[PDB]
Amino acid sequence: AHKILHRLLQE
Amino acid sequence: YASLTEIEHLVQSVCKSYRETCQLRLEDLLRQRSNIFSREEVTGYQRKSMWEMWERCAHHLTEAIQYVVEFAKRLSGFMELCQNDQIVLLKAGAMEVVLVRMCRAYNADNRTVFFEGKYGGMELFRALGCSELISSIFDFSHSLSALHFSEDEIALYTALVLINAHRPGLQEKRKVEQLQYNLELAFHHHLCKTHRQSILAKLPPKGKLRSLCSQHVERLQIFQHLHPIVVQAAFPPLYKELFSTE
């Protein structure tokens, strides 16, 4: 998978 | 920042942010130094498949990176940057911070690193098939060990490793330049007050950390080529986003 950072930052 | 009060507020803010995201406490890491892998266990680690050993290391690295993300999230000034730049900084910086963070879990007296509940040497990672990368990292940790970093110093240096204005892809370079400067002012102020400015000339270059991250990616691409299904099936998503670049 990918685009994990975005999810981690928005939380 | 136009006063010592403000800069000293930044110092403490950054230290506090590191404390709340250090993953493993310094006390805990020191209290486990006599807990070293036996030769039976070492031989067991060496007899593990290359792909499982890569998988375990990838999992632990990714776990470590999550705490670097949270450090960054709690870092004064970082969340006010646009997320594009937050992602540019973390893509290029996360691994580096972890490499610097790793010297706390490294024992210079016997040359062992804390890994899966015990301390082990370079030979513990022989199954990976990337001897140079391992030696380099162990040497990198060994030379940081020689500086006897305090927790405060670690925090400020890692903040500066993360907040680097010269990363390609930054849309707000000037904003990142300003943050860096303030963190640099804080770091140097702390070192001045604490009579520790001598370590400045002993910090390794920006090129050294980059050389270590470059190597990590090289070796992954070689492993990726041999076990592409394991990378897809068995590696952490965040690891692949940061390093696999497919």
Ligand SMILES: CC(=O)N1CCN(c2ccc(CN(C3CCC3)S(=O)(=O)c3ccccc3)c(F)c2)CC1
């Ligand atoms: C915060 C803290 O103190 N810790 C303890 C050390 N911990 C750790 C991380 C990665 C590796 C694995 N890697 C290095 C260690 C020598 C090999 S690595 O991620 O750089 C790597 C992964 C895959 C291939 C080669 C190296 C490892 F063993 C431990 C991170 C968390």
